[PDB]
Structure formats: C-alpha cells, structure tokens
C-alpha cells in the first residue's frame, strides 16, 4: 500500500464497527418492537367495534 492508495484507506478493510453505541446510552434503544398479534382474525371482532348498540341491546 503506497502513495494515494493509503489515502483510500477508508475503502479497504478498515471496516467500521457496526455496534455504534453500547446498551447504556442508546445502542439498542431503537430495537424495541411491540409484540402484537401481527395478523388478527377480524371475523369475530367486526361485530363489536362498529355494532356496539346492537350488542348492548
């Protein structure tokens, strides 16, 4: 590695760390996902979300 090639030392294997920050002060503070149902069966529910007065009567 000589000359201007060393100047290109960022495009060679000097691979930056993927883990930007630790668990303390961020790092994994944006990896939280709400564990929903992900695919509900609205068949039994689309009678209680809109048809509420009929269920009350």
């Amino acid at each position: 590695l000589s000359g201007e090639a060393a100047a290109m030392y960022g495009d060679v294997v000097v691979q930056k760390t993927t883990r930007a920050c630790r668990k303390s002060e961020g790092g994994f503070k944006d990896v939280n996902t709400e564990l929903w149902g992900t695919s509900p069966y609205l068949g039994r529910g689309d009678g209680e979300v809109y048809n509420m007065p009929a269920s009350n009567q």
Binding site: G37, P40, Y41, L42, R44, G45, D46, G47, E48, V49
Partner: peptide, 11 residues
C-alpha cells in the same frame, strides 16, 4: 388490571 376481553375483539 382486569383484562379487557371486551376491547380485544380481534384477539
């Protein structure tokens, strides 16, 4: 903390 089965219409 009664679980609202009533509000879990799709679950």
């Amino acid at each position: 903390l009664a679980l609202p089965l009533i509000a879990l219409q799709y679950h």
